[PDB]
């Protein structure tokens, strides 16, 4: 089957100080532990599939976000 | 495999059966040629000739290796040669000892 | 060993405060410097190996009793770990620490009228490495600022472009410059993994290697042996 | 009497005296090893249609990931390798790179800094002096193959003295026409085309007859202890690149066509055995420099 | 060499055990083919893998290969997105380092790039393995250095209020059997420039 | 069937021979080079050996590339060497020349 | 009475043979008694470089 | 080679090395240079006191 | 030194000792003399067929 993705994974948060002077936009893709002394590319491949699962792009998909609007 | 000086031998019956030939061909295939002696090689050829070709041990006696190979090849038997074994280069890590 | 192990300007200046001038000088006559000699290096060649004796070899050499000889002995101690043979310096100067000789007016020594170009030539500045060059310039700056000869120090640096690039960034009178300095001046130190117990071709290289190899053993077995002699004695 | 000498043997400038210790020699060996992996990884990257092998190799060499917008200089290792090459050539070079940088770069790989486990043959002809009488004109051309052209306008035959130094092992001496050559205080033999000589056994005399000029070609071979990883093809390429890049532009120095001329000229100084080891280390650095620059052009 | 044979045998068994664990990677149709002679499914697959070593068979690059390859490249290239970095810097407080000031953080632990030079001299760089074996660490940390040749995992919590920006744990742990860097967790606070109490702290 | 069993199960026997060799000190191995011999195998045993060829895993024995049991077994020979010299010298000093 | 290096020396009336045997035994065991730092140096030479 | 390795290691602070002539290490270098220094004043003093 | 010791054992049919200089053994001896025999007729050519 071909799955249909309704919403776009922006993965964004907004952090602002109490007084309001400072604010920033942070993209949270998670935390992934990395072990030293062994090849990094092999660990990246394992995390790549988990990252694709989080974004919902592992399986064949077609984006439908056309109806997500208001006037 | 560990010691080259050791050897492999066999003794077959006066009238070889299909098992004797099977045992003989398994040795010439999967055992080092340095372990099978020239005299054992001729005996393994003789026991194959007695079974595959219609002959007895007394007739194939005083027959050289080359003659026995020719007899078996004409009958259609290709397993008439010994095969040398490759030498695997081994090292033992030193640790406390010097190493070997 | 202790002087060559210091890796910061703070540590080097602190060590020179606690070290008397007796440690800088030596009581062994040695040999005359600037001599073309043939030494034995059987590790590499059957024939004898040519070399030239210098004041920064790490072995005591004869020196004169003037002001220049005392300054050259101090600089050699900082950059090579061993000083020269200056006959009969006197107890008055031996008790004083190295820094007071370099940066004080109470020693009774007139260190003015000093030529840094002549001193640098005698110490073979062309043969010393970056750390040894840096240490030599530190001594020059301390001497220049004490006698009010900061202009002559700048003139010397202008004539020698390679030394100007690696000049120390501290000002002798200001403490803030000393604490914030990030120079690395460690000739010897405990190395990761180890170093082979093999000889080197040059007199300077072999003597320097002998200091690095023996630093590890000196580090572990010096506290007790020094304490046994230090106990029941008054410091100079 | 007239004296003729080889051009490349005149006034060898002093070489640097820094970065010749065990720690620095390990750094040069590490640089050569990592440079070779850089060239190999780029070839593997081209073959497999993936940049993964090159990223790993560049990350180890330069301690940073490659970037599309930034340029591939090679990192701090590239700067240190260029600086040590400058210091090796002349004693007037700055020699600025500190020891803490040298040790930190030698720890990347585990290779000994031995520079005496092999040898290489350098085919440069040392002609220290060719003493000639009056009326006889001698010209020495070339270093790899030295052609000596002599002719005499006098009435009688002349004696020409040849000195090849005490460093070269064998010298093979070929003439255009058969000629007689013998050592000092030895009978002259029959004229023959070729001569094999050990430069150690004293000066040699060649009889020059009156008439057409005699052109004599010289070829010499000298063995110098070099590391195992030495490669004359790579070293010579690195020598040209460094000269092209201005690494050797230091005042009061001499310049040479090739690396073998440089190493033989320094060998023939007043005390030449001092400079051979420094020159050998320079050769391995140039081999590393050539491999790195070909992978990372600038 | 005996070392190569031992290495190949051990690696091959690890692959087979992992492949056949949980849901097997190979369908039951291939197992039926490889078990026709009588050998078990694990053994039949094991011999086939040995034969395929050194093959020149062309394999088509499916779309999911490219997707994983693209993500893997971005994982290595952009490490800070995923919570790890390749180098860290330890400096004393009195040394002034240039830091990022766009976010208005009090004593910001972030820099645009780690300084090449501080006070006119290049910052010392030490690999983690060398730093672990150092017994003169007390002298080294006085000047400041950059730790590299390792992958450092870090996390940060941005706090809305104002306070002292500090790490959750101590920077390093010193033991007899080597040194180590404790886990990195930042408590970053926004800055009010006129708070004398928090400035002195 | 013999060839298929041979090709599938040769890695385990190659590793097994290495592990056995690593248990022998160099001095003992050099002595065994002097001896020689020949082993006689019944034909039924040989054919049954290749036909029913068991697989030797030997995976849990190795921790990475280090075999703890073999490394520790080689080390106790150094203790034996120390005891041999210690015992021999003590008997020589205690008893001296021996006369019968 | 104390020795120069801190050892204690006992002067007593004892036999010639008993003194000879006992003190020779002491000297044999003493040459195998070494400081810890010297022991570490010997160990470091046997183990690999790192 | 066991007796020679032990004696050489004590003498040279390094074990004998394959593909490398054994000359005695730093002890041999120091001994050779001091012999030269003993003969004449003109011979230099090269070995440091450490 | 294991890879070199293993390769030298195949070339020279012996495991080298520390003091004895490594030169290649019989293979080096045969190769050097055969090279001489190729160059000229006058060469001794003293290598046995065994």
């Amino acid at each position: 089957e071909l799955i249909k993705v309704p919403t776009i994974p922006h993965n964004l948060v907004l952090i602002q100080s109490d007084n309001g002077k400072h604010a920033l936009i942070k993209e949270d893709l998670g935390q992934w532990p990395v072990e030293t002394g062994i090849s990094l590319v092999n660990q990246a491949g394992v995390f790549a599939v988990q990252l694709a699962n989080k974004l919902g792009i592992d399986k064949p998909f077609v984006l439908d976000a056309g109806s997500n609007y208001f006037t | 495999c560990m010691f080259k000086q050791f050897r492999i031998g066999m003794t077959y019956a006066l009238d070889p059966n299909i098992m004797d030939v099977a045992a003989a061909t398994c040795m010439l295939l999967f055992r080092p040629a340095q372990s099978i002696s020239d005299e054992q090689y001729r005996y393994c050829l003789q026991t194959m000739a007695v079974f595959l070709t219609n002959t007895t041990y007394d007739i194939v006696n005083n027959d050289t290796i080359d003659v026995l190979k020719m007899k078996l090849r004409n009958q259609g038997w290709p397993f008439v040669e010994r095969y040398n074994a490759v030498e695997i280069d081994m090292s033992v890590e030193p640790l406390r000892s010097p190493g070997q | 060993m202790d002087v060559l192990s210091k890796g910061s300007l703070k540590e080097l200046l602190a060590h020179l405060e606690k070290t008397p001038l007796e440690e800088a000088i030596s009581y062994r006559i040695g040999t005359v410097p600037y001599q073309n000699v043939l030494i034995s290096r059987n590790e590499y060649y059957n024939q004898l190996y040519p070399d030239t004796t210098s004041l920064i070899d790490g072995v005591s050499r004869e020196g004169q009793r003037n002001v220049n000889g005392l300054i050259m002995s101090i600089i050699s101690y900082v950059v090579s770990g061993s000083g020269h043979y200056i006959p009969n310096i006197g107890f008055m100067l031996l008790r004083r620490s190295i820094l007071d000789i370099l940066t004080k007016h109470d020693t009774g020594l007139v260190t003015n009228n000093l030529n840094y170009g002549i001193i640098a030539r005698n110490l073979t500045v062309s043969k010393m490495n970056c750390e040894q060059r840096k240490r030599m310039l530190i001594c020059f700056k301390l001497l220049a600022y004490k006698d009010g000869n900061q202009n002559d120090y700048e003139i010397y640096l202008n004539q020698n472009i390679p030394l100007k690039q690696i000049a120390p960034n501290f000002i002798p009178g200001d403490m803030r410059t000393v604490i914030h300095n990030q120079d690395q001046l460690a000739i010897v130190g405990i190395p990761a993994y180890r170093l082979t117990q093999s000889t080197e071709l040059s007199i300077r290289d072999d003597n320097a290697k002998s200091y690095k190899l023996g630093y590890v053993d000196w580090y572990n077995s010096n506290s007790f042996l020094r304490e046994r002699s230090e106990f029941n004695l008054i410091r100079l | 009497a007239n004296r003729a000498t080889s051009a490349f043997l005149d006034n060898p400038h002093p070489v640097g005296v820094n970065y010749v210790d065990e720690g620095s020699r390990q750094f040069v060996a590490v640089a050569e090893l990592l440079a070779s992996k850089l060239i190999d990884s780029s070839r593997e990257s081209d073959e497999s249609n993936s940049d993964v092998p090159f990223v790993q190799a560049y990350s180890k060499f330069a301690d940073d990931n490659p970037r599309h917008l930034r340029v591939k200089t090679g990192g701090k290792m590239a700067n240190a390798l260029t600086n040590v090459i400058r210091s090796y050539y002349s004693i007037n070079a700055p020699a600025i790179v500190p020891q803490v940088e040298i040790d930190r770069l030698a720890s990347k790989a585990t290779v000994s800094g031995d520079m005496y486990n092999s040898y290489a043959i350098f085919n440069s002809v040392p002609i220290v002096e060719v003493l000639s009488p009056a009326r006889t004109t001698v010209s020495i051309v070339g270093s790899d193959r030295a052609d000596v052209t002599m002719l005499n306008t006098g009435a009688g035959a002349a004696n020409i003295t040849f000195n090849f130094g005490q460093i070269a092992e064998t010298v093979i001496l070929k003439g255009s026409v058969p000629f007689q050559l013998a050592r000092l205080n030895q009978p002259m033999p029959a004229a023959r085309f070729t001569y094999k000589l050990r430069p150690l056994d004293g000066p040699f005399i060649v009889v020059l007859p009156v008439g057409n000029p005699l052109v004599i070609s010289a070829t010499a071979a000298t063995r110098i202890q070099v590391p195992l990883a030495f490669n004359k093809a790579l070293v010579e390429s690195g020598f040209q690149t460094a000269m092209n890049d201005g690494l050797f532009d230091i005042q009061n120095v001499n310049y040479y066509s090739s690396f073998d001329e440089f190493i033989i000229s320094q060998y023939h100084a007043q005390d030449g055995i001092n400079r051979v080891s420094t020159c050998v280390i320079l050769g391995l650095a140039l081999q590393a420099y050539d491999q790195m620059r070909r992978a990372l052009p600038v | 060499t005996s070392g190569s044979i031992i290495n190949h045998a051990n690696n091959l068994n690890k692959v087979i055990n992992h492949v056949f664990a949980d849901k097997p990677l190979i369908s039951e149709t291939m197992l039926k083919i490889l078990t026709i002679d009588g050998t078990t499914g694990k053994d039949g697959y094991r011999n086939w893998l040995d034969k395929l070593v050194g093959h020149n068979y062309p394999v088509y690059v499916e779309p999911v290969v490219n997707i994983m390859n693209f993500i893997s490249a971005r994982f290595v290239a952009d490490s800070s997105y995923f919570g790890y970095t390749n180098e860290i810097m330890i400096m004393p407080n009195h040394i002034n380092v240039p830091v990022d000031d766009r976010f208005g953080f009090r004593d910001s632990p972030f820099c645009t790039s780690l300084p090449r030079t501080i006070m006119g001299n290049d910052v010392r760089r030490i690999s983690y393995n060398v730093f672990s074996m150092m017994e003169d660490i007390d002298d080294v940390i006085s000047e400041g250095f950059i730790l590299y040749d390792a992958y450092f995992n870090f996390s940060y919590d941005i706090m809305t209020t104002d306070g002292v920006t500090r790490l959750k744990e101590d920077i390093l742990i010193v033991t007899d059997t080597g040194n180590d860097i404790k886990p990195i967790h930042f408590y970053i606070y926004f800055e009010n420039r006129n708070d004398k109490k928090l400035r002195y702290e | 069937a013999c060839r298929d069993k041979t090709s599938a199960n040769w890695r385990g026997y190659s590793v097994l021979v290495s592990r056995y060799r690593s248990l022998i000190p160099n001095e003992l191995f050099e002595s065994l080079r002097n001896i020689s011999g020949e082993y006689n195998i019944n034909p039924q045993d040989e054919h049954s050996f290749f036909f029913a060829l068991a697989q030797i895993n030997a995976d849990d024995e190795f921790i990475g590339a280090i075999d703890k049991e073999s490394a520790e077994y080689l080390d106790e020979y150094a203790t034996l060497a120390r005891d041999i010299s210690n015992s021999l010298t003590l008997v020589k000093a205690a008893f001296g020349p021996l006369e019968r | 009475y104390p020795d120069a290096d801190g050892n204690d020396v006992s002067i007593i009336f004892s036999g010639a043979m008993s003194h000879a045997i006992f003190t020779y035994a002491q000297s044999q065991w003493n040459k195998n008694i070494i400081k810890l730092d010297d022991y570490i140096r010997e160990i470091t030479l046997t183990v690999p470089k790192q």
Side-chain angles (χ1 to χ4, degrees), chain C residues 73-93:
Chain C
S73 183
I74 285 155
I75 302 199
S76 324
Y77 169 75
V78 178
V79 310
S80 36
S82 178
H84 312 318
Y85 175 59
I86 293 133
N88 304 332
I89 311 203
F91 172 65
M92 291 295 308
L93 281 180

mmCIF file of all heavy atoms in Angstrom, chain C residues 73-93:
data_model
loop_
_atom_site.group_PDB
_atom_site.id
_atom_site.type_symbol
_atom_site.label_atom_id
_atom_site.label_comp_id
_atom_site.label_asym_id
_atom_site.label_seq_id
_atom_site.Cartn_x
_atom_site.Cartn_y
_atom_site.Cartn_z
ATOM 1 N N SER C 73 75.314 32.113 31.528
ATOM 2 C CA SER C 73 75.146 30.908 32.333
ATOM 3 C C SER C 73 73.693 30.719 32.747
ATOM 4 O O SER C 73 73.183 29.592 32.751
ATOM 5 C CB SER C 73 76.050 30.966 33.561
ATOM 6 O OG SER C 73 75.956 29.773 34.319
ATOM 7 N N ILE C 74 73.015 31.808 33.110
ATOM 8 C CA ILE C 74 71.617 31.715 33.527
ATOM 9 C C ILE C 74 70.746 31.257 32.363
ATOM 10 O O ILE C 74 69.894 30.372 32.513
ATOM 11 C CB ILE C 74 71.137 33.063 34.092
ATOM 12 C CG1 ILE C 74 71.708 33.293 35.490
ATOM 13 C CG2 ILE C 74 69.621 33.121 34.119
ATOM 14 C CD1 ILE C 74 71.801 34.750 35.869
ATOM 15 N N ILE C 75 70.950 31.850 31.187
ATOM 16 C CA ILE C 75 70.131 31.508 30.030
ATOM 17 C C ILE C 75 70.374 30.065 29.610
ATOM 18 O O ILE C 75 69.444 29.355 29.209
ATOM 19 C CB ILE C 75 70.399 32.493 28.879
ATOM 20 C CG1 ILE C 75 70.099 33.922 29.334
ATOM 21 C CG2 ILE C 75 69.560 32.131 27.666
ATOM 22 C CD1 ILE C 75 69.892 34.899 28.205
ATOM 23 N N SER C 76 71.623 29.604 29.698
ATOM 24 C CA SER C 76 71.921 28.211 29.386
ATOM 25 C C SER C 76 71.214 27.267 30.350
ATOM 26 O O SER C 76 70.734 26.201 29.949
ATOM 27 C CB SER C 76 73.431 27.976 29.414
ATOM 28 O OG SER C 76 74.129 29.101 28.913
ATOM 29 N N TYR C 77 71.146 27.640 31.629
ATOM 30 C CA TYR C 77 70.441 26.818 32.605
ATOM 31 C C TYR C 77 68.959 26.708 32.270
ATOM 32 O O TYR C 77 68.355 25.642 32.431
ATOM 33 C CB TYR C 77 70.636 27.394 34.008
ATOM 34 C CG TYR C 77 69.748 26.772 35.061
ATOM 35 C CD1 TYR C 77 70.006 25.501 35.554
ATOM 36 C CD2 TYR C 77 68.654 27.458 35.566
ATOM 37 C CE1 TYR C 77 69.198 24.932 36.516
ATOM 38 C CE2 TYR C 77 67.841 26.897 36.528
ATOM 39 C CZ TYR C 77 68.117 25.635 37.000
ATOM 40 O OH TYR C 77 67.309 25.073 37.958
ATOM 41 N N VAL C 78 68.356 27.804 31.805
ATOM 42 C CA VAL C 78 66.931 27.795 31.495
ATOM 43 C C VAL C 78 66.648 26.939 30.264
ATOM 44 O O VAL C 78 65.649 26.213 30.215
ATOM 45 C CB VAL C 78 66.421 29.236 31.315
ATOM 46 C CG1 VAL C 78 64.947 29.239 30.953
ATOM 47 C CG2 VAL C 78 66.658 30.037 32.579
ATOM 48 N N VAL C 79 67.520 27.002 29.258
ATOM 49 C CA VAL C 79 67.234 26.353 27.983
ATOM 50 C C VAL C 79 67.902 24.991 27.819
ATOM 51 O O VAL C 79 67.507 24.227 26.928
ATOM 52 C CB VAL C 79 67.641 27.265 26.814
ATOM 53 C CG1 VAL C 79 67.069 28.655 27.007
ATOM 54 C CG2 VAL C 79 69.152 27.323 26.685
ATOM 55 N N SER C 80 68.897 24.661 28.642
ATOM 56 C CA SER C 80 69.597 23.390 28.513
ATOM 57 C C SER C 80 69.704 22.599 29.807
ATOM 58 O O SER C 80 70.141 21.445 29.761
ATOM 59 C CB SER C 80 71.012 23.606 27.951
ATOM 60 O OG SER C 80 71.579 24.809 28.437
ATOM 61 N N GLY C 81 69.329 23.168 30.948
ATOM 62 C CA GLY C 81 69.362 22.453 32.204
ATOM 63 C C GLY C 81 70.704 22.425 32.899
ATOM 64 O O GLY C 81 70.805 21.845 33.987
ATOM 65 N N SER C 82 71.736 23.025 32.312
ATOM 66 C CA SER C 82 73.058 23.055 32.917
ATOM 67 C C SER C 82 73.732 24.375 32.582
ATOM 68 O O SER C 82 73.550 24.926 31.494
ATOM 69 C CB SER C 82 73.926 21.883 32.439
ATOM 70 O OG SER C 82 75.225 21.949 32.999
ATOM 71 N N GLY C 83 74.518 24.879 33.533
ATOM 72 C CA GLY C 83 75.197 26.145 33.394
ATOM 73 C C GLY C 83 76.683 25.974 33.139
ATOM 74 O O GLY C 83 77.177 24.877 32.866
ATOM 75 N N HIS C 84 77.391 27.092 33.238
ATOM 76 C CA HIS C 84 78.807 27.144 32.919
ATOM 77 C C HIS C 84 79.646 27.339 34.175
ATOM 78 O O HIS C 84 79.136 27.478 35.288
ATOM 79 C CB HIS C 84 79.076 28.258 31.906
ATOM 80 C CG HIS C 84 78.141 28.238 30.740
ATOM 81 N ND1 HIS C 84 77.775 27.070 30.108
ATOM 82 C CD2 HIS C 84 77.494 29.235 30.094
ATOM 83 C CE1 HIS C 84 76.942 27.350 29.121
ATOM 84 N NE2 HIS C 84 76.755 28.657 29.091
ATOM 85 N N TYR C 85 80.957 27.347 33.975
ATOM 86 C CA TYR C 85 81.933 27.410 35.060
ATOM 87 C C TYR C 85 82.493 28.826 35.130
ATOM 88 O O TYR C 85 83.378 29.195 34.355
ATOM 89 C CB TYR C 85 83.033 26.378 34.841
ATOM 90 C CG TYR C 85 84.162 26.441 35.840
ATOM 91 C CD1 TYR C 85 83.928 26.284 37.196
ATOM 92 C CD2 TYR C 85 85.468 26.645 35.420
ATOM 93 C CE1 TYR C 85 84.963 26.338 38.108
ATOM 94 C CE2 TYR C 85 86.506 26.700 36.323
ATOM 95 C CZ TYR C 85 86.249 26.545 37.665
ATOM 96 O OH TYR C 85 87.287 26.601 38.567
ATOM 97 N N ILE C 86 81.971 29.618 36.059
ATOM 98 C CA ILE C 86 82.451 30.967 36.327
ATOM 99 C C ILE C 86 83.220 30.927 37.646
ATOM 100 O O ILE C 86 82.621 30.687 38.704
ATOM 101 C CB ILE C 86 81.301 31.980 36.378
ATOM 102 C CG1 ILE C 86 80.674 32.133 34.995
ATOM 103 C CG2 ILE C 86 81.797 33.323 36.883
ATOM 104 C CD1 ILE C 86 79.172 32.072 35.005
ATOM 105 N N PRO C 87 84.535 31.143 37.635
ATOM 106 C CA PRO C 87 85.329 30.944 38.856
ATOM 107 C C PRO C 87 85.040 32.004 39.908
ATOM 108 O O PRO C 87 85.040 33.204 39.620
ATOM 109 C CB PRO C 87 86.777 31.035 38.354
ATOM 110 C CG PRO C 87 86.692 30.826 36.875
ATOM 111 C CD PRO C 87 85.384 31.409 36.465
ATOM 112 N N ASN C 88 84.803 31.547 41.137
ATOM 113 C CA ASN C 88 84.745 32.397 42.328
ATOM 114 C C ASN C 88 83.750 33.547 42.160
ATOM 115 O O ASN C 88 84.108 34.725 42.150
ATOM 116 C CB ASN C 88 86.138 32.919 42.681
ATOM 117 C CG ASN C 88 87.144 31.803 42.867
ATOM 118 O OD1 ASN C 88 86.788 30.688 43.245
ATOM 119 N ND2 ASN C 88 88.409 32.099 42.604
ATOM 120 N N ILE C 89 82.478 33.176 42.020
ATOM 121 C CA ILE C 89 81.425 34.177 41.897
ATOM 122 C C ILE C 89 81.267 34.957 43.196
ATOM 123 O O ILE C 89 81.106 36.183 43.184
ATOM 124 C CB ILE C 89 80.107 33.507 41.475
ATOM 125 C CG1 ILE C 89 80.356 32.584 40.283
ATOM 126 C CG2 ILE C 89 79.060 34.558 41.147
ATOM 127 C CD1 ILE C 89 79.136 32.313 39.453
ATOM 128 N N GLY C 90 81.313 34.271 44.322
ATOM 129 C CA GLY C 90 81.150 34.909 45.612
ATOM 130 C C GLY C 90 79.849 34.496 46.278
ATOM 131 O O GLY C 90 78.826 34.254 45.624
ATOM 132 N N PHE C 91 79.889 34.415 47.611
ATOM 133 C CA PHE C 91 78.712 33.994 48.364
ATOM 134 C C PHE C 91 77.584 35.011 48.266
ATOM 135 O O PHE C 91 76.410 34.648 48.399
ATOM 136 C CB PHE C 91 79.088 33.758 49.826
ATOM 137 C CG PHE C 91 77.911 33.498 50.717
ATOM 138 C CD1 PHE C 91 77.131 32.370 50.544
ATOM 139 C CD2 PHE C 91 77.581 34.386 51.724
ATOM 140 C CE1 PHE C 91 76.045 32.130 51.362
ATOM 141 C CE2 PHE C 91 76.499 34.152 52.545
ATOM 142 C CZ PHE C 91 75.730 33.023 52.364
ATOM 143 N N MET C 92 77.914 36.282 48.038
ATOM 144 C CA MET C 92 76.892 37.322 48.008
ATOM 145 C C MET C 92 75.918 37.114 46.856
ATOM 146 O O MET C 92 74.708 37.311 47.013
ATOM 147 C CB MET C 92 77.556 38.695 47.913
ATOM 148 C CG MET C 92 78.313 39.097 49.166
ATOM 149 S SD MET C 92 77.243 39.311 50.598
ATOM 150 C CE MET C 92 76.022 40.437 49.935
ATOM 151 N N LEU C 93 76.425 36.714 45.689
ATOM 152 C CA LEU C 93 75.560 36.516 44.533
ATOM 153 C C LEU C 93 74.973 35.111 44.483
ATOM 154 O O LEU C 93 73.923 34.909 43.863
ATOM 155 C CB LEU C 93 76.331 36.805 43.245
ATOM 156 C CG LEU C 93 76.507 38.277 42.876
ATOM 157 C CD1 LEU C 93 77.292 38.415 41.584
ATOM 158 C CD2 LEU C 93 75.159 38.968 42.762
#
